[PDB]
Amino acid sequence: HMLRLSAPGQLDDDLCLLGDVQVPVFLLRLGEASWALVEGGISRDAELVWADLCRWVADPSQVHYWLITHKHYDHCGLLPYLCPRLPNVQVLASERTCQAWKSESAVRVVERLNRQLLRAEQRLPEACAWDALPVRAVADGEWLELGPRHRLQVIEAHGHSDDHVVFYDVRRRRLFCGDALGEFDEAEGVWRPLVFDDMEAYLESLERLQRLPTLLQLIPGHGGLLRGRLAADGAESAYTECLRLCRRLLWRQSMGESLDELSEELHRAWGGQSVDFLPGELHLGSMRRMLEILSRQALPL
Ligand SMILES: Nc1ccccc1C(=O)CC(=O)O
Ligand SMILES: [Fe+3]
Ligand SMILES: [Fe+3]
User: Fold this and answer.
1) Is 158 helix (H, G, I), strand (E, B) or coil?
2) What separation in Å is there between the alpha carbon of 183 and the centre of ligand 2?
3) Could you name the domain of life of the organism this protein comes from?
């Protein structure tokens, strides 16, 4: 399709997609000798992403910034493995995201989930300690002056997770929105909600993002770059699809169903797209946790 760029390589004059479209790392050319990465992927893609990077960046000491939307295993798993190869990089993440990398228990979950995605006999590169990453915490509303023609604003966008932020390039009307709009359904052209922490926060974030100046390019955590009406309408549509799922959950619960029936239907209808980076039972469990969250906020009793 023409409204979705979903191939590795060059996406715009300044922008390349590294790695797998399903868990991409984005490469921004900031100047003649300066680059940034956006999104932090899964650990097992370290050598894939590195090889792709080296196709575009002759000297990786020119990679100066690495922007991170949130702490989930599939958005920061590359950091320990590529940061030793990027001597001048500064990781830019929210305060809460940074705190996750200081917690043994949080780091433990991230490593376990990423380890489950290793192909057999696959070994990972030498790693920076999670608590020694070259991180700089960024605040809600902070302007990131990455280069002469790259200025991106940090926007808090909690709900999917309690630490989640997005990055807005107003010059290009380009939003790196992470998972705050959900998972874009490639077969059907709609957003699938990913409400894994707080429903009211998730919806309130979408309300705020809808108020941004009209988007030309919308870049979530998975699936590539969206443009035209998909970008312009994305935040509003994601909001609408979340309400649709809430109503659906209430309809079925009013028929006496347990959360497990719609959980299984959601896993059936939606689990295929992420199967290669969501190990084992995590998708079905993610659907369950989402419906639990929605049920607590929206159930009448
Ligand atoms: N793409 C997904 C589809 C279903 C469940 C979770 C995800 C994630 O993307 C993981 C996450 O970051 O929360
Ligand atoms: Fe996430
Ligand atoms: Fe994700």
Assistant:
1) coil
2) 10
3) Bacteria
20 known member of a binding site: no
In sequence order, which residues have a C-beta less than 8 Å from that of residue 8 and are 6 or more positions away? 17, 18, 19, 20, 21, 52
Q: Are 169 and 117 in contact (CB under 8 A)?
A: no
Q: And the tokens for 179?
A: 């998972």
| 207 Cα–ligand 3 center, Å | 21
- The answer to whether the annotation marks 160 as part of a ligand binding site is yes
Could you tell me the resolution of this structure in angstroms? 1.9
Phi (first) and psi of residue 272, to 5 degrees: -65, -35
Burial 53-74 (b: 16+ CB within 10 A, else e): beeebeebebbbbbbbbbbbbb
Ligand 1 neighbour 164 (Cβ under 6 A): no
Experimentally determined by: X-ray
- CB of 39 shorter than 6 A to ligand 1: no
Ligand 1 touching residue 72 (CB < 6 A): yes
Token pair of 104 as six digits: 């043994």
Kindly list the distances between the CA atom of residue 216 and the CA atoms of 119, 173, 300, in Å, as whole numbers in the listed order: 37, 5, 39
Q: Residue 224's domain is classified under what CATH number?
A: 3.60.15.10
Residues 6+ apart with CB under 8 A from 258: none
Q: State the total domains in the chain.
A: 1
For 252, the token pair is: 């079925």
Look up the domain containing 250 and give its range. Answer: 1-301
Is 72 annotated among the ligand-binding residues?
yes
